[PDB]
Amino acid sequence: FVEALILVIIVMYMFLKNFRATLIPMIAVPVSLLGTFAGLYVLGFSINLL
Amino acid sequence: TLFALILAIGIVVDDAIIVVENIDRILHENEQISVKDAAIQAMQEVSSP
Amino acid sequence: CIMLGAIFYLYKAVPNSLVPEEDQGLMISIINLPSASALHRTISEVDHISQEVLKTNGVKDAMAMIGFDLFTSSLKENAAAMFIGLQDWKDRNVSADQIIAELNKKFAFDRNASSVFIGLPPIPGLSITGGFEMYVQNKSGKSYDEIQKDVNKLVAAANQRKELSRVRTTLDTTFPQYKLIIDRDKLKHYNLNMQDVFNTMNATIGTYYVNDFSMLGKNFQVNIRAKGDFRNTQDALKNIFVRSNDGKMIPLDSFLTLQRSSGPDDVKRFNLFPAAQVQGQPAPGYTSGQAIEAIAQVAKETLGDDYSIAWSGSAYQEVSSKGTASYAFALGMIFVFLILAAQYERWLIPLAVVTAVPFAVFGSFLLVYLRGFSNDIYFQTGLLLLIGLSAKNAILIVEFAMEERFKKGKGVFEAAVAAAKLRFRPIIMTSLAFTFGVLPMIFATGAGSASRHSLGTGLIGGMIAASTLAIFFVPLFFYLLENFNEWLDK
Amino acid sequence: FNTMNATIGTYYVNDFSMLGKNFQVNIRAKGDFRNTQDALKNIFVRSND
Amino acid sequence: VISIVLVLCAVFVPVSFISGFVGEIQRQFALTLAISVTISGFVALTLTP
Amino acid sequence: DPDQATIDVNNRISAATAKMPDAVKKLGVTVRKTSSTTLAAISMYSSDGSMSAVDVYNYITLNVLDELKRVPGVGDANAIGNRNYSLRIWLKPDLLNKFGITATDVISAVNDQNAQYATGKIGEEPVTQKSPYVYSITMQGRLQNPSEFENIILRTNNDGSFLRLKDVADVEIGSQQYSSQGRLNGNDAVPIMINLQSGANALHTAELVQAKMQELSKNFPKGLTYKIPYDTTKFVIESIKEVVKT
Amino acid sequence: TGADAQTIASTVASPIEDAINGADNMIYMDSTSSSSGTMSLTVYFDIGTDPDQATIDVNNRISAATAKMPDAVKKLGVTVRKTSSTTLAAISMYSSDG
Amino acid sequence: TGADAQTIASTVASPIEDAINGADNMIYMDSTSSSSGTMSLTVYFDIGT
């Protein structure tokens, strides 16, 4: 998770040039994955290998 | 449930034909208006019922 | 279209598998001294095998359950199972593949006690990851010494040729026993009852549970039994007496003349009827599904008019039903086509988005062919993610091609190029942020590498061909289909 | 009680096995009496003597 | 983007309709990705812009 | 809910097995979930006449009836009459008194000479003298065929001979009970009544019944056939087709 | 306690003839009668079944199938146990040298 | 009946208590044992079961 998050940091600075642009995916990816945990919880799933 | 579906055959087409019929009225009373625009004038009349 | 045929051969020439086994620090050994045998002799061998397994540099800890055979789920005294734990992969310099190929070669071809070393499966559902587990019943009810002579027709021929290479059975009536023969004429000529003579035999050369006694709070059993030295002999029945009705004491050697015999140690009843368990696994190249279709075919041939070729284990979960794997993908495509047809407002345009999917499955089925892998289910898992991403980018491509040709008013050719020009930057930077993201799975060093070595090798080559090979043909199909759509105005 | 239940009626006793399943052994006197008063003449039971 | 969610869930949910021993494993992967596509798709057109 | 109601009755039977007669306790009060009506009724008979009637009942209690109890949805599958063969002991009060034998002598002799008891193993563990092998002990205490039952000796005569059971009784494998018979168009047939669960799908389960009967039909011996003339779900199927027509 | 496995095969034929139950439950079952003195009867239920429901169902029926049991078994005990629960961890206890 | 108040709690309540412990949604339990032969064990469960 944190590796792909850092790869996003690198790709965002290389293709757009401003650090203000790399800060926005630093809030989308945490909240999206974090919300996905709520989805897996209420729907019924549990944290396992698969 | 299968009795209600045969019951629905005569009510499902109620709203369909009640709009298609009002299209025919506008067409036989308006030589100028086109079919695509007549469907617009139809839903103006027979949407509340 | 030539690439489409390349996928048909790529799919037909890759090994159809299920899940891949991986190195999780775990070992199991099925120790089997010769039949009958004794407990102390098994102990003398358990502490001898549990000593040389600790000799290997990749072994950490071990423990055994003496006197319980896992081949039968019973506690036979002539067998034992050993649970071995390996070191951590950061310390051990070898995997369990060559350790098993070393140990099951060192022991299984030497000692009088057979010791086959294997490993626990990764997923507890399957029984032997590729083989079967079937029972053969008999409604007619025949003697076990004859059903033993009937299962031999199956197992000995199932290993001959055909499609299997190790078909086993767990039924063995050639187990040594002492059959006592009664002389009812004597037993009653001697003026005795049978409830008495066998109640006193259960208290001498058997275990007899009388009542309980109090100690430390818990109430434990008390058990009457002759001292072991006057029971280990062949005919220890010669010094056990029973009080007669008249008053005299009578030796059991008069009417109970013991004699040797053969009979099964563990009798198994599967679904109301006596049955025998059949276990095995296919040959190197044969698939699992057809291998289950192999024993079924050969058992219809070498059985009788009363033996039900019943099914259990994992081989029953696969035989249960069929007809579902297709009518789910089909409606999935229909819902995909309609979801797009409602978006693009044309019927012959969503076909452009669909065409960008065979690129993902071509690049995914190519890298798993060069590396020499098999299309398991962890690899097909990432194949779903790649179709969902390849089709996603293709939607936005055709979306901007529709926007360019009908809003900005550019021609079909100039719009099919201007759309691919717009979508080129995001498609590349997602691929570079994703291919590099799941790149640590290609060189995965640790537990669970069976998945990531096939997941990565799948969707890395798929991501390359779905965002470099694919981005050239999505505009072509828009150019072809949109021009054909405007033709239909005529 | 077990004498009347094993001569006039059917008795339970332990079971036996054949052909696979386990069936019962059942005891009842084959002496058939159209009446009943003559039955008690011929059915005996020894006492504690 | 809305069509992406309605089309990615159109490929994740169907593979969850196979009741096989293998299919019950793949239902874990698919429905997890379907929750991700829908939840991250909602975040995409609300929180991101 | 059939189960919520079932395990609510259970929590009242065990709660009230105290205010209970001791004789009913030993055989056990049984609670089960099954419909009060009958879902179907199968009939088996001999298409020629060699299988008779009481023999067909046995083919059911050996191969057929056990599999019918396991298809999904069925609640009960009893064959009426209880005409499966038992080992019958026919005493004769004449010869019982010609030899001074009361019926109780035959009761204890049969109960004792036919039972099966625990024996043990030879040379297990609390031993100091080394034992190379370890052997089990087969028993064989029951009696298989009626001839062995005739030789149950009630009394041992002082002249060496024994008063056997056959000398005062008749032994034959007959029937657990012949209190009922069965007909199907006049022919001697065995009836099997099939019940439904408490809330299953009568259409679904009763169709799986006929499918399983067809499976066991392949192993029928000689002229043993079967017909299911009573099925409360076939009317439902034939009335569903009428609505499709309508 | 004792008994040739053939005799234990005729004391499992009572629960076997009894564990034929399940409204939406049982698929098959396998019993193993052993000369070691024990008999393990494993009943498998159809996938997607409440393990508590399967346990209470098979256990409710054995209470009525105990009247036909030998006294040496009614005295010792018959036990049911759900085995679909995932096995967490194992523990080994021993005394070193001492 | 016929047992000491302490022997009832030691030989009757203990193999019961030790076997019930570990139940799902169980908070606590107590067993009163009297010389009158009665062993009353009440098992309390979590609120809402």
Numbering used by the authors:
A (entry chain B): 346 to 395
B (entry chain A): 396 to 444
C (entry chain B): 544 to 1033
D (entry chain A): 741 to 789
E (entry chain B): 445 to 493
F (entry chain A): 100 to 345
G (entry chain B): 51 to 148
H (entry chain C): 51 to 99
The authors write:
Surprisingly, in the form II structure, the periplasmic cleft of one of the protomers is open, albeit similar to the conformation of the “binding” state of AcrB. We labeled this conformer as the “binding” form of CmeB. However, the periplasmic clefts of the other two protomers are closed in conformation. One of these two CmeB molecules is more related to the structure of the “extrusion” conformers of the form I structure. Thus, this conformer was classified as the “extrusion” form. Interestingly, the other CmeB molecule of the form II structure displays a distinct conformation, forming a new state that is different from the “extrusion” form. This conformation probably represents one of the intermediates that the CmeB pump must go through during the transport cycle. We thus designated this conformation as the “resting” state of the CmeB efflux pump.
This tripartite system is composed of the CmeB efflux pump, an inner membrane resistance-nodulation-cell division (RND)12 transport protein that contains substrate-binding sites and transduces the electrochemical energy required for pumping drugs out of the cell; the CmeA periplasmic protein, a member of the membrane fusion protein family; and the CmeC outer membrane-associated protein that is integral to the outer membrane. To understand the transport mechanism of the CmeB efflux pump from C. jejuni, we here define the X-ray structures of this membrane protein, which assembles as a trimer. Each subunit of CmeB contains 12 transmembrane helices (TM1-TM12) and a large periplasmic domain created by two extracellular loops between TM1 and TM2, and between TM7 and TM8, respectively.
